[PDB]
Design a protein around this ligand. Structure first.
Ligand SMILES: *[C@@H]1O[C@H](CO)[C@@H](O[C@@H]2O[C@H](CO)[C@@H](O)[C@H](O)[C@H]2NC(C)=O)[C@H](O)[C@H]1NC(C)=O
Ligand SMILES: *[C@@H]1O[C@H](CO)[C@@H](O[C@@H]2O[C@H](CO)[C@@H](O)[C@H](O)[C@H]2NC(C)=O)[C@H](O)[C@H]1NC(C)=O
Lengths: 49, 50
């Protein structure tokens, strides 16, 4: 009357193929907060009485 | 030779060093202001001795 069976093998997950990476050289720039700086010369005369 | 074993490959996670990184240093921030009040004062208080 009562009859059972063994379970058969299963499909195991495939190992994912994986990511591909591009080799490159990179230079990262940011916002400039430094003021523009340039040298100048002042000419004036102090006066007093 | 045939094998009854099932393979498994475990490689340890390699070491990795973190170098210090700053987007802006505090000297650049102090230089961000168009006029550092202290330096202006020190320059302008030398007129008689100069
Ligand atoms: C990175 O390159 C490999 C090269 O083999 C890609 O392999 C592909 O694998 C998928 C499975 O998702 C297949 O559909 C493609 O036919 C394979 N292509 C080739 C040329 O073998 C891999 O998929 C690529 N990266 C990603 C994220 O898929
Ligand atoms: C066991 O460890 C890794 C897979 O996790 C494999 O080692 C790397 O294999 C790649 C090619 O897939 C080589 O370019 C590297 O030199 C290997 N070493 C490292 C540290 O990446 C290794 O092949 C695996 N074992 C088998 C039998 O495939």
């Amino acid at each position: 009357a009562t009859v059972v069976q063994f379970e058969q093998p299963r499909r195991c997950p495939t190992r994912p193929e994986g990511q591909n990476y591009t080799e490159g050289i990179a230079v990262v720039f940011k916002e400039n907060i430094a003021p523009y700086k340039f040298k100048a010369t002042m000419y004036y005369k102090d006066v007093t009485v | 030779t045939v094998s009854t074993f099932i393979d498994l490959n475990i490689t340890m996670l390699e070491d990795h060093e973190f170098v210090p990184l700053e987007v802006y240093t505090r000297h650049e921030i102090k230089d961000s202001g168009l006029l550092d009040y202290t330096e202006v004062q020190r320059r302008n208080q030398l007129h008689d001795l100069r």
